[PDB]
Amino acid sequence: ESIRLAVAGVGNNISALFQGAELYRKMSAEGVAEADFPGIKRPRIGGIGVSDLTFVAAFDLHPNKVGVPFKDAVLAEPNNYPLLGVELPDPGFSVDAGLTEEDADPSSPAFRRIVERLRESKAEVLLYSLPTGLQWAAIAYARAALEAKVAFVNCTPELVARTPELLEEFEKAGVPLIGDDLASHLGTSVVHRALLGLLSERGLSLASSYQLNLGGNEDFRNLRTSNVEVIPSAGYVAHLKDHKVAMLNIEGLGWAGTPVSIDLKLKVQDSSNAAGVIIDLIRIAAAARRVGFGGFSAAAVKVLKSPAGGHPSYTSEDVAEAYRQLDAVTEAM
Amino acid sequence: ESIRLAVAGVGNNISALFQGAELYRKMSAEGVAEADFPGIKRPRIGGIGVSDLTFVAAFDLHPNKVGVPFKDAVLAEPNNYPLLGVELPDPGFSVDAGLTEEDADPSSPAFRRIVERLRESKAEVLLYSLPTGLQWAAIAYARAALEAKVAFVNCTPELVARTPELLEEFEKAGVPLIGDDLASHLGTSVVHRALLGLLSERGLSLASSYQLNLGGNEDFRNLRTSNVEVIPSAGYVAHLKDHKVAMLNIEGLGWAGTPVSIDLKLKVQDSSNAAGVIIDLIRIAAAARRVGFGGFSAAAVKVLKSPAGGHPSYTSEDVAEAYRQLDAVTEAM
Amino acid sequence: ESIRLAVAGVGNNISALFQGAELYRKMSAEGVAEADFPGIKRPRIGGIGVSDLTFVAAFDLHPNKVGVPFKDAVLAEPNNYPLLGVELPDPGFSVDAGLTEEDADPSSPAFRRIVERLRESKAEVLLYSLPTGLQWAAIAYARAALEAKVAFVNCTPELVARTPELLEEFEKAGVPLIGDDLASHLGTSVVHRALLGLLSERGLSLASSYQLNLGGNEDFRNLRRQSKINALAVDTSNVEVIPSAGYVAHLKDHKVAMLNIEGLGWAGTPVSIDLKLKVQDSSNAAGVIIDLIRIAAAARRVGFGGFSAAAVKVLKSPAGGHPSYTSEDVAEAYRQLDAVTEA
Amino acid sequence: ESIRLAVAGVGNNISALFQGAELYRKMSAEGVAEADFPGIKRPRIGGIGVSDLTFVAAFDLHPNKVGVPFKDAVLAEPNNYPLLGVELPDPGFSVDAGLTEEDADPSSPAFRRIVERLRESKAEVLLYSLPTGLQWAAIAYARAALEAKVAFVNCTPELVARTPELLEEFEKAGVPLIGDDLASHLGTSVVHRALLGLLSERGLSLASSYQLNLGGNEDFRNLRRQSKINALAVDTSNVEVIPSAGYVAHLKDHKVAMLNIEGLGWAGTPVSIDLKLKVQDSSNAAGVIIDLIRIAAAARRVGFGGFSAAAVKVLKSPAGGHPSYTSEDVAEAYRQLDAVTEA
Numbered sequence A, B: 001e002s003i004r005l006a007v008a009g010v011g012n013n014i015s016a017l018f019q020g021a022e023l024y025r026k027m028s029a030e031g032v033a034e035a036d037f038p039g040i041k042r043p044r045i046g047g048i049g050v051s052d053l054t055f056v057a058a059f060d061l062h063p064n065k066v067g068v069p070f071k072d073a074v075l076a077e078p079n080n081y082p083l084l085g086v087e088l089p090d091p092g093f094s095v096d097a098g099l100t101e102e103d104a105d106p107s108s109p110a111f112r113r114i115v116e117r118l119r120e121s122k123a124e125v126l127l128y129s130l131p132t133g134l135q136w137a138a139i140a141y142a143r144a145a146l147e148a149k150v151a152f153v154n155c156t157p158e159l160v161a162r163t164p165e166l167l168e169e170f171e172k173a174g175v176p177l178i179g180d181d182l183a184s185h186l187g188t189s190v191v192h193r194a195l196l197g198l199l200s201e202r203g204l205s206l207a208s209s210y211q212l213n214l215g216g217n218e219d220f221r222n223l224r225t226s227n228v229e230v231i232p233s234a235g236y237v238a239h240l241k242d243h244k245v246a247m248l249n250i251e252g253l254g255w256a257g258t259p260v261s262i263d264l265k266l267k268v269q270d271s272s273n274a275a276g277v278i279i280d281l282i283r284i285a286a287a288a289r290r291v292g293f294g295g296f297s298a299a300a301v302k303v304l305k306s307p308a309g310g311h312p313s314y315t316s317e318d319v320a321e322a323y324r325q326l327d328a329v330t331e332a333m
Numbered sequence C, D: 001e002s003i004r005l006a007v008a009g010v011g012n013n014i015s016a017l018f019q020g021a022e023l024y025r026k027m028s029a030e031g032v033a034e035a036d037f038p039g040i041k042r043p044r045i046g047g048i049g050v051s052d053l054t055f056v057a058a059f060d061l062h063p064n065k066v067g068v069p070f071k072d073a074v075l076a077e078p079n080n081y082p083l084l085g086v087e088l089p090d091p092g093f094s095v096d097a098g099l100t101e102e103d104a105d106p107s108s109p110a111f112r113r114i115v116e117r118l119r120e121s122k123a124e125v126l127l128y129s130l131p132t133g134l135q136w137a138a139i140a141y142a143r144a145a146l147e148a149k150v151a152f153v154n155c156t157p158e159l160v161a162r163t164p165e166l167l168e169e170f171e172k173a174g175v176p177l178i179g180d181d182l183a184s185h186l187g188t189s190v191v192h193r194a195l196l197g198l199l200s201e202r203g204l205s206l207a208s209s210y211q212l213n214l215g216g217n218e219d220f221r222n223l224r225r226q227s228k229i230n231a232l233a234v235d236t237s238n239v240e241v242i243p244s245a246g247y248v249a250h251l252k253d254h255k256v257a258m259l260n261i262e263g264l265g266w267a268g269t270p271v272s273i274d275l276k277l278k279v280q281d282s283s284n285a286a287g288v289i290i291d292l293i294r295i296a297a298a299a300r301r302v303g304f305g306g307f308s309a310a311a312v313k314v315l316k317s318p319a320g321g322h323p324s325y326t327s328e329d330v331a332e333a334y335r336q337l338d339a340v341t342e343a
């Protein structure tokens, strides 16, 4: 059974998820088994395929996107995720207007429209995909979803699954709250840290390290160990669009203080790094709501920077246990 | 108590170990604690410091090195490990002549001289540091060491700790046999494999990868997953000397088949990559002979490519247990 | 007015040229002006556009290519230039059998058949695009072309335009002979050389440099160099070229170059350069072939036989040698060739 | 015959120049001929060697540098050019106080003291090596130098040699004025520009390029660019320069450059270039200062006041502008300067 998905923010991430889902649908037609799908960690989570996605509802504020049909809105400037060259289906609907800051309060009429629209579209999951920095919106879309009984997924660093009192409510309603903050499918950081891990595991000394990142999309434009230096915003480069380039240097010291030098360059489709992980959180969301597991799922920990309860309080057994019980409860029901 | 060390082959590795040991001795004088030593995994193994090294005996065949005083022999052309700029001590002795292929047999007089020289120098460890490819020599130096009751350490890919019947003998005499084949302190391979590990751990698809290596020393000159390609001998480059340069490419595929590109360059002092690991094997050797633990030590597994018993049959608990019992038996005695 | 173009060897280079020409034809329709064509230094040469190409004749020895229709032969194994995603047209002919070493001699039945095919197909230019190392074939296809009055283009390091008596005969017969040896559109060695140029021009001292190349096509597999190390002469006592570091199957027709330069500046402090170059190796051919084949055809139309100086900048080994030619020699030949075609 | 050299600003550049000069002095002893000196384009300029330097005078405002003996001041925080491991000599003087913005005016007690110090120290050249952005100081130290008849060298982008009336006065007084703005021995922008040059010279199309720089010294911290993007003009609608990507403390006086060039060749196939440049940023200064200060001194000894054309290749903003000078203009000035010194 397909996930009925609502979207708060129709950016590069949603362009990647929407086009992505129909590329995998096309590969199924062509004759590719999901075992062989590129970029897919779990091809099934509670029986949900990577392609078992229906968009039912969408909220933006941007004039190119509000009261545009969804199909057209996702591809609309200033979105610069590439055309993946797949005839995308028209899912029948038009992007509703989002909450402005003044409509934060659950008693606003805007608020009332969103709650009514989630109820009427029979959404299961609301995907929060806004610009980073809007704490009022993350809270607001989450109470909207909460009141509507719809699972909430926070892609952003805003406190939602991390505000202890809002988690309690979600726990109490049998509603899943997945957050906070996407860990990129394969990001600068996880590569940088693996290499520094290698140096100290084998007993090399770190003299210094730097990592710097370049991007050309709205996300990047918005955001813009003694001798480790991290520059998460080295420069906006318009021609890079939704690509992100990272360059890192490690200077280690080996036997006798001889230098170990590492020079590394990473290029990725930045919003594929989002999609690669949203498609897991989306499915942990839906499968949990269907089986009534409200609050935070430990299945979501490995693909989140700031999960409810914090990384320190979780082993990868906790994670694998949660996938096993979520999948085994669904098989059962 | 200092390790009395014999050396079969006075190459770049021994230049690195000999100079290295006196650089750490100098840092102790200057006022550096061994906690803060660059490139040192275990600063103590059975009470042995990285600087608790006495060369007592040496075998080569090269005219620059045979019947030269050791101090001068290690630095002698065609050795191109750098002068680390430390006044090295003169350990009093001269490099004896090695075994030629015809003197393989334990009944040769050459053989008799080596066995007598290990006995007279009261060596504890014989370090086998010859060119790769000389199976007759690895066997011969090992029987020489065996008869002499002296621990044997194989840096090379030749079968020694891996020939089942020769291990049995070493087991039976209470003599340690550490082998086979050094894993570089931080080599091309361990970096390449960690990065490929990252791609499949997170569920990225590998499209291709290549790794190529460049060197300019005698070792390199001697040696000279469907779409992974490893070129361990991309080219001899004389000006690189004992430096080794590695370049690797990984092309992954992410969500929706978007490319993940990685480009990496590693430069190291290749024979510091040997020294960084010999200094551990050397000490597992000595400490085991002092405490009468003959045969293979599991402590040696993490720093060997082809350990006796094979990597598959060892967990890092086996390794850490063996360090704990070796150190705890020495404290005890 | 389209070049009737004959091909000795249906390799990566002709996959690139044929598909390339139909990609530019497509861009013409979909709207793009030829001044905006990517990778074209000169969009017309004696009024011949980058797309004004009719393949009339093709010669190979590989069983996947012989008696296969051209359209299919160019894409056929082990050719691994990419599919460019253009409706490649069917020119309506098939790859005939080439000369094997024993058919070298002009009175062989092969030789007579080829001189037949060049005359019958009304070819204007024969493009010699065989593997490097086949001196008998370069000579043979060249005398084949001469006999039938068809212009000859040598992609390879083989001696053809450089043998003064064969040049003389071509010169006197009113037939163009263009060679020898393609200088790649953008080659490893011009990049390495330019950077070394910079260091010594501003007086930085060279400690050391290396260049290594990686490839995965039949050309690279065949080559498997002195020209490269001359290029860089600059103290070269510590400059190493590895022109074949290794064959990487999944690169196909891609070529990768990696270079290191270690300078010393004031007080012997290091100036370090690390560079990676990636290119479509056979685009580096076709980007220069399209120049030479048009230099060829327009010259035969205007009866300028022998070597054209317009060919010099895109050749390693032009007839008469680089030292006997300036930029103006090359320009004078382009301007004269274009302007005579005019009248 | 040694240059008596005065310094306005004891930064990384003078750490590099002072230690550099004593490293070459050491190499002379330990045996090395000056033609084998690393990083020296011209080992003599009017018979002045790379080591023929007497520091006589020094002016700063930083408390670690003022009233400290020169020897100690050059190495003093926050100067982070390396120690080169040479016995640096003690020239026997101490860093005097510089001009603060209020002491600009020539009748201030500071100004009078400095004109005192230049006359008393018998300085021949005043090297202006302050931070970029201080137009009042460049003018002030320049009139200070003029009044005392001492040659002036402008390292900075400030208008000095380029203000035509100050030039006129220097010209007429028989005093050399050399400026403005050092072109680094080997700079990011000449590498980027050379590579972009290659692509368009051979007719490859630019899709896109970026250049970013990293540093860790006071110069880089101060700068924290238009000149850079002009250099590269070549379709630059997709060429981005970030001249200050970020300040990395553990780089100190090192500077790192990273560049990307994305060309299109035949049939729009990509030509990709990735480059890393590492240099000792203040060696890139001293490698050119040693040229300018000798151009300065030899010209004052021979009474060639005003701007010398020999200075052109090592300056961004020479008096009269690059467009009014050829390579021969520069050569003619070097050859004349050396040869007059002779007689």
Ligand SMILES: NC(=O)c1ccc[n+]([C@@H]2O[C@H](COP(=O)([O-])OP(=O)(O)OC[C@H]3O[C@@H](n4cnc5c(N)ncnc54)[C@H](O)[C@@H]3O)[C@@H](O)[C@H]2O)c1
Residues within 6 Å of the ligand: A008, A009, A010, A011, A012, A013, A014, A059, A060, A061, A062, A065, A079, A098, A099, A100, A129, A130, A131, A132, A137, A155, A156, A157, A181, A182, A183, A184, A217, A218, A219, A270, A271, A272, A273, A274, A275
């Ligand atoms: N791989 C990654 O992209 C990565 C990594 C970690 C976290 N994230 C985070 O994911 C988020 C989404 O990034 P993206 O590339 O999709 O961003 P984007 O900037 O392209 O999309 C944001 C969308 O939200 C819309 N919007 C703004 N205010 C709104 C409102 N009040 N209501 C509804 N819509 C509103 C914008 O108009 C736009 O359509 C960002 O916060 C980013 O930092 C992404």
Ligand SMILES: NC(=O)c1ccc[n+]([C@@H]2O[C@H](COP(=O)([O-])OP(=O)(O)OC[C@H]3O[C@@H](n4cnc5c(N)ncnc54)[C@H](O)[C@@H]3O)[C@@H](O)[C@H]2O)c1
Residues within 6 Å of the ligand: B008, B009, B010, B011, B012, B013, B014, B059, B060, B061, B062, B065, B079, B098, B099, B100, B129, B130, B131, B132, B137, B155, B156, B157, B181, B182, B183, B184, B217, B218, B219, B270, B271, B272, B273, B274, B275
């Ligand atoms: N990091 C590394 O260097 C690394 C990695 C893994 C394994 N290894 C292996 O370590 C070994 C030693 O490398 P190296 O750099 O010291 O080598 P090297 O080639 O510099 O030294 C070899 C020495 O052995 C001497 N020799 C040759 N035949 C001899 C004989 N019969 N008896 C005695 N001496 C003899 C040679 O003259 C020379 O002095 C090589 O087999 C290498 O492959 C090294």
Ligand SMILES: NC(=O)c1ccc[n+]([C@@H]2O[C@H](COP(=O)([O-])OP(=O)(O)OC[C@H]3O[C@@H](n4cnc5c(N)ncnc54)[C@H](O)[C@@H]3O)[C@@H](O)[C@H]2O)c1
Residues within 6 Å of the ligand: C008, C009, C010, C011, C012, C013, C014, C059, C060, C061, C062, C065, C079, C098, C099, C100, C129, C130, C131, C132, C137, C155, C156, C181, C182, C183, C184, C217, C218, C219, C281, C282, C283, C284, C285
């Ligand atoms: N960047 C470049 O690609 C570049 C640069 C300069 C020069 N060149 C040279 O151009 C030549 C062609 O390059 P390519 O990649 O197209 O090579 P290729 O290997 O792809 O093409 C060679 C073709 O010749 C055919 N052939 C072999 N023997 C023949 C014979 N006797 N008669 C007729 N056909 C025969 C082969 O089957 C194959 O079809 C090579 O010599 C290469 O070095 C290429």
Ligand SMILES: NC(=O)c1ccc[n+]([C@@H]2O[C@H](COP(=O)([O-])OP(=O)(O)OC[C@H]3O[C@@H](n4cnc5c(N)ncnc54)[C@H](O)[C@@H]3O)[C@@H](O)[C@H]2O)c1
Residues within 6 Å of the ligand: D008, D009, D010, D011, D012, D013, D014, D059, D060, D061, D062, D065, D079, D098, D099, D100, D129, D130, D131, D132, D137, D155, D156, D181, D182, D183, D184, D217, D218, D219, D281, D282, D283, D284, D285
């Ligand atoms: N590669 C290069 O280093 C390079 C290239 C071209 C131009 N330049 C320019 O040369 C100049 C010097 O470079 P640097 O790295 O030596 O700089 P620095 O910051 O190391 O030196 C500046 C010095 O000026 C001193 N000072 C400040 N105000 C003063 C005043 N009013 N009077 C006297 N002294 C004063 C500062 O304390 C410091 O000692 C900078 O403008 C730089 O841009 C450098």
Ligand code: NA
Residues within 6 Å of the ligand: A012, A013, A219, A270, A271, A274
């Ligand atoms: Na994004």
Ligand code: NA
Residues within 6 Å of the ligand: B012, B013, B219, B270, B271, B274
């Ligand atoms: Na070695």
Ligand code: NA
Residues within 6 Å of the ligand: C012, C013, C219, C281, C282, C285
């Ligand atoms: Na080719």
Ligand code: NA
Residues within 6 Å of the ligand: D012, D013, D219, D281, D282, D285
């Ligand atoms: Na500087």
